[PDB]
């Protein structure tokens, strides 16, 4: 039962981190503090299939 409780908490903390990460991502997106990184890139020249 203790293992059940702890692994419940383990997967629940995994979900905690993923939703909290998403919320922090969308919170930092608008303020422009993450400008230039891979989460807010800038346009450049076009490219082809080859």
């Amino acid at each position: 039962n203790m293992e059940e409780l702890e692994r419940k908490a383990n997967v629940q903390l995994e979900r905690q981190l993923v939703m909290a990460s998403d919320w922090s991502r969308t919170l930092l997106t608008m303020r422009g503090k993450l400008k230039g990184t891979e989460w807010d890139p800038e346009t450049s020249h076009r490219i082809n299939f080859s």
Partner: protein, 96 residues
């Protein structure tokens, strides 16, 4: 596999659409679908949204936006999850 939940997945979403299902990425959806952690997978009638329904978590259901590639459907198969598509009526594409 004779679970009492035969077809109570898509209809229940069509009723409790008023719920707020938070967003989740594609690759984590794959990484948790493979894990045999999810109870069902639900297809939207335009195949541009997919409402997951796992077995444990808070919340159970989310929204995962989807790219159309075959390996998606391959892991949906090899995971062994409940596959269904919500059918909308024929006015909703005329209301739009």
């Amino acid at each position: 596999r004779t679970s009492e939940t035969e077809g109570t997945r898509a209809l229940w979403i069509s009723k409790r659409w008023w719920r707020y299902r938070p967003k989740l990425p594609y690759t984590y959806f794959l990484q948790k679908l493979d894990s045999s952690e999810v109870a069902a997978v639900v297809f939207t009638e335009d195949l541009k949204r997919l409402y997951v329904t796992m077995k444990e978590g808070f919340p159970l259901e989310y929204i995962v936006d989807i790219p159309l590639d075959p390996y998606l459907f391959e892991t949906i198969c090899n995971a062994g999850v409940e596959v269904d598509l919500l059918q909308k009526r024929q006015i909703h594409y005329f209301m739009k």
